[PDB]
Chains A and B, each alone.
Chain A
């Protein structure tokens, strides 16, 4: 229906936005510079900026696994208000990468992305504020988009003080520090400023207080109070741009509310306003103004890269500005050139931070196309700027009817860092003030039809029109039956009918975030139920062979195109040979060309048989080792149309979300093998050749150059099978496209390890067994066990390209492998709405229950699951799908039965049943007496199970938590250093982790022993642990603890911290101090 315009590029143009403003905007504003003296100047040009073509692309960029970039450039204006020396030329400023095709910034290495933040966009607000008894209080507060906080208050008594970056002074010199005009307050306040006439304790003397009290009279103490003192002070809180803002907006707002004419293009601050506060608070004190909102967009507000990459660039440059100010004015300046006094390096770095290291990037998780939807656009308030994650206590966490239509509630990591991830209205958009949009569609008191205007604002807020929720029985051309409809005033939802409203859905779902839409009929499923399940597909695994869903709500296809995995024409064409490797309106020489010149265009080279070249992707290691190779979809010579997806990537056939497959599902508590939770499925799945991950992950290795006496890789060293050493190559290297399996061998590290202090046996043994080998060593790479993966590429390189190398290091060895790998047991597979599943066992394609038509089914469930999960509709689909499957039925229809406004769903189902089975011939797939059931003749030997049980088609979707990367178990190994205890960071030698909550449950029976061991010798005692090793292989009764030592360790630091202990026997001569050290 109506078109919903591109989620993604929130960022982009906003991103773009920035440069098509920002670069200058700031920098020019602090445009001019010069020697401290002032004569020899220099400027940022702040105009006609320039940068050249950075031939690095994204793939060629990932090629050197480095950052994309655009060398960044600008000239100065000139040299001096000394004699108008120009000496202009460009001066390079700050190169760095930027937005990438798949919505990334391909920095070094990789392609992270940045998450938006909310924050209390600026302004100056004010606590209503209450007490230990009831009698209440008033207090005021001020803060721009960046800077101090001007804060105000009421000691019961129409009093005040002023607190800012101090929190130490009940100090109140209101108007006694700036604009001390004869009783200017009875000129700006006029109404009850301090009972209309100050109070006792307040005097308002200013002669030596304006710029000289509460600034040194308690503030900032000890020197004398120079009138200048506070003067240049209070510039130095305020006046002085570069240490304070509003933020253009800030004003926009600030004023706008307090509405006072100050349009005034100043991103800093006046007096009067302040007053206008001051009143204003007292205005609310006399209950004339309402309390500010402090919780949602009312005070909070997005922001995003532009400013994220803008605030700091002014700062990063502000840094430079210091330095230059020296550097420019460091000595002679006659010819010393713009070009001379310009250390870009800072800026580039720091920004290199702000992509690269601002805690803000993530790694753009591409485990699933969808994900990179979402992760386009979650957002938070974690932020340098943001909140704590534990002092941002509650409302912070909750919701707010602003959220309705502005952000989705079905989005929540349900973690200690959840309730902080703005879903971003499925449709929203935003403005220069960040505030997002959420349409409010007009209804002319009874007539909507969307012919009326507006229908496109309610940005961040509302209209005080009691307001039409999304849907309601909307008659043909609108007339909006509902006798008396409920609809929302402001955070409230009263009833009223076509008179008084007029704004209503765009569509019946303005409160979702990329995956919360998957639910085909969430209309029928509890909200508390819909969450993690809706976040499952959010991070689904891909799957070699994709498949649209079955059943249809269909919103998404497009979204898949937004992802990028699927490719639309850039332009146009009708494909020539569409070779898998090369589709082409490329150098086609043909009619993918010609529409590739349809009504051609110019900066696009229609100039010659059109020319749209670009390479598809094979299976590449995702930032999460996920993989996908798209697919040459559109066969040759078959017309296209601008910007329509023609490439079938990860998970679409055709611009739709390939998530799962479609599967018959009889819920059935049979012989157990599942009894919550617990999936059972039939071996067919494997033979089905579906449910087949593939993964590919780095391994790499490198060699040092030891200052111990450098070492290389080898091409072998001993005990090498060539059986090892064989499918090896010509340095030691490992041949690619080669099968590997378990403790396989990558390639030949050669290491140093001399025998100066020849171990006691050493010299001899060596010479005694009968041979004189040498310890030139080799920790060459042995791929982990179970690595039955054919090897599938390598990127690799040494000194010569300039190894772009972590220094101190010689040559890259990175290479790796995948494997086709079908699903197994414990696979966290499930659905997309309140789900989470794993499987025992799979099973003979035959024993599993089958059908009277005669086919065998392929997914049990349990049956009780769902009624309990209170997620019903899973039925629904089952059903619906059934259809689909019986009569190849598609749906792609938004959720929520709104048709007629009741259980039409129903109506649907039984319907599409009905005919389907009617025309199904056998007409058994449905029974009048089984309106939604089927029979279940298929016991152990295929009896008739008894009660006609329902079955049908679900959308089983598997996850990552694959036992493979989630396996774990090991027998000792390296302990730590410090505790020297082995260590489990979830590695091959991962600590069987440990829980004292259990050592607080392992004594409930006591018998030490296990404990005793159970600490010791597998923690402290060296000679214990070993003692063990022996005991068993030494046919010895593993003894007796060591004594712990970490203990002793703890004791050591304590003894130094200032401890002493006589620890000791006492049956000894007058006890003593047993040497336990």
Chain B
């Protein structure tokens, strides 16, 4: 709460108040005459270490700013490009002879940290059309938990596998 200085008033020494936009070091300093706009307050703005700028958008905007560095700047060549939209919905499947017949894991440009991916490839090897046995030989991850997605695949010109049939149907004794 407050009081005066032992009697007095309230003397607004008037003058020109200057709402000078935030993040914009005003230009004029002490005791100098400027006037109705002769250069006067500016975040003479200044930033640091991001990358290439395909150019922010501001058609009808002084700034509207969106300062892109766009900078996961992997310069790829040969990830070729294809479609399907009718009985699924849409795509650019990647498609290069360099084992690049992918789809679009992430979209055509979504944006997301991990599980990063493009597109999903086809690799028919280590397919089959009858069941399994993973009794394999001499491939190796070391178990490392993500012997799983999180897959390692270093070393194995050998997949010793005994495809099969399996029917986990706990049922009464003597069905047929």
Task: Give residues in A with beta carbon < 8 Å to B.
Answer: 39, 80-84
Cα–Cα, bound, A80→B88 (Å): 8
Contacts of B88 in A (CB 8 A): 81
Contacts of A81 in B (CB 8 A): 86-89
Cα–Cα, bound, A84→B88 (Å): 8
Quick one: CB contact mask for B87-104 with A, threshold 8 Å, 1 for yes? 111000000000000000
Cα–Cα, bound, A742→B151 (Å): 99
What 3 A-B pairs have minimum CB-CB distances, sorted nearest first? A84-B86, A83-B87, A84-B87
11 contacts between A and B (CB under 8 A): A39-B87, A80-B87, A81-B86, A81-B87, A81-B88, A81-B89, A82-B87, A83-B86, A83-B87, A84-B86, A84-B87
Contacts of A80 in B (CB 8 A): 87
Contacts of B89 in A (CB 8 A): 81
CB distance from A652 to the nearest CB of B (A): 50
CB distance from A686 to the nearest CB of B (A): 72
Contacts of B87 in A (CB 8 A): 39, 80-84
Quick one: CB contact mask for B79-90 with A, threshold 8 Å, 1 for yes? 000000011110
Name the prevailing secondary structure of the A interface residues: loop
Nearest residue (CB) in A for B66 is A261
Cα–Cα, bound, A82→B87 (Å): 5
Cα–Cα, bound, A83→B88 (Å): 8
Name the prevailing secondary structure of the B interface residues: loop
Cα–Cα, bound, A126→B88 (Å): 47
Nearest residue (CB) in A for B64 is A261
CB distance from A397 to the nearest CB of B (A): 36
CB distance from B23 to the nearest CB of A (A): 13
Contacts of A39 in B (CB 8 A): 87
Cα–Cα, bound, A84→B89 (Å): 10
Cα–Cα, bound, A789→B150 (Å): 93
Cα–Cα, bound, A555→B56 (Å): 55
Nearest residue (CB) in A for B89 is A81
CB distance from A184 to the nearest CB of B (A): 16
- Which residues B24-82 have CB closer than 8 A to chain A? none
CB distance from A77 to the nearest CB of B (A): 12
Nearest residue (CB) in A for B85 is A84
CB distance from A299 to the nearest CB of B (A): 27
Cα–Cα, bound, A84→B85 (Å): 9
Nearest residue (CB) in B for A84 is B86
User: Given A82-B87, A84-B86, 9 more contacts at CB 8 Å?
Assistant: A39-B87, A80-B87, A81-B86, A81-B87, A81-B88, A81-B89, A83-B86, A83-B87, A84-B87
Cα–Cα, bound, A81→B86 (Å): 6
Cα–Cα, bound, A72→B86 (Å): 29
Nearest residue (CB) in B for A86 is B86
CB distance from B138 to the nearest CB of A (A): 40
Quick one: CB contact mask for B103-138 with A, threshold 8 Å, 1 for yes? 000000000000000000000000000000000000
Cα–Cα, bound, A218→B71 (Å): 45
Contacts of A82 in B (CB 8 A): 87
Cα–Cα, bound, A39→B86 (Å): 11
Nearest residue (CB) in B for A80 is B87
Contacts of A83 in B (CB 8 A): 86-87
Cα–Cα, bound, A80→B89 (Å): 9
Contacts of A84 in B (CB 8 A): 86-87
Cα–Cα, bound, A674→B70 (Å): 90
Cα–Cα, bound, A305→B87 (Å): 40
CB distance from B122 to the nearest CB of A (A): 20
Contacts of B86 in A (CB 8 A): 81, 83-84
Cα–Cα, bound, A71→B86 (Å): 32
CB distance from B89 to the nearest CB of A (A): 6
Cα–Cα, bound, A296→B32 (Å): 47
Cα–Cα, bound, A81→B89 (Å): 7
CB distance from A692 to the nearest CB of B (A): 65
CB distance from A863 to the nearest CB of B (A): 58
Cα–Cα, bound, A39→B87 (Å): 7
Cα–Cα, bound, A81→B87 (Å): 3
Cα–Cα, bound, A82→B86 (Å): 8
Nearest residue (CB) in A for B86 is A84
Nearest residue (CB) in B for A39 is B87
Cα–Cα, bound, A39→B89 (Å): 10
CB distance from A79 to the nearest CB of B (A): 10
CB distance from B41 to the nearest CB of A (A): 20
Nearest residue (CB) in A for B65 is A261
- Which residues B154-171 have CB closer than 8 A to chain A? none
CB distance from A93 to the nearest CB of B (A): 24
Cα–Cα, bound, A82→B89 (Å): 10
Cα–Cα, bound, A218→B89 (Å): 42
Nearest residue (CB) in A for B88 is A81
CB distance from B174 to the nearest CB of A (A): 34
CB distance from B112 to the nearest CB of A (A): 15
CB distance from B171 to the nearest CB of A (A): 27
CB distance from A785 to the nearest CB of B (A): 76
CB distance from B104 to the nearest CB of A (A): 16
Cα–Cα, bound, A642→B87 (Å): 57
Cα–Cα, bound, A147→B89 (Å): 32
Cα–Cα, bound, A80→B85 (Å): 11
Cα–Cα, bound, A357→B89 (Å): 42
CB distance from A995 to the nearest CB of B (A): 59
CB distance from A134 to the nearest CB of B (A): 12
Cα–Cα, bound, A365→B86 (Å): 55
CB distance from A8 to the nearest CB of B (A): 36
Cα–Cα, bound, A80→B86 (Å): 8
CB distance from A579 to the nearest CB of B (A): 60
Nearest residue (CB) in B for A78 is B86
Cα–Cα, bound, A1032→B66 (Å): 99
CB distance from A337 to the nearest CB of B (A): 18
Cα–Cα, bound, A997→B89 (Å): 75
Nearest residue (CB) in B for A79 is B87
Cα–Cα, bound, A1062→B39 (Å): 102
CB distance from A89 to the nearest CB of B (A): 19
Cα–Cα, bound, A734→B87 (Å): 69
Cα–Cα, bound, A712→B71 (Å): 89
Cα–Cα, bound, A383→B88 (Å): 45
CB distance from B17 to the nearest CB of A (A): 15
Cα–Cα, bound, A810→B88 (Å): 57
Nearest residue (CB) in B for A83 is B87
Cα–Cα, bound, A80→B87 (Å): 6
CB distance from B90 to the nearest CB of A (A): 10
CB distance from B93 to the nearest CB of A (A): 16
Cα–Cα, bound, A82→B88 (Å): 7
CB distance from A334 to the nearest CB of B (A): 14
CB distance from B86 to the nearest CB of A (A): 4
Cα–Cα, bound, A84→B83 (Å): 14
Quick one: CB contact mask for B135-157 with A, threshold 8 Å, 1 for yes? 00000000000000000000000
CB distance from A264 to the nearest CB of B (A): 12
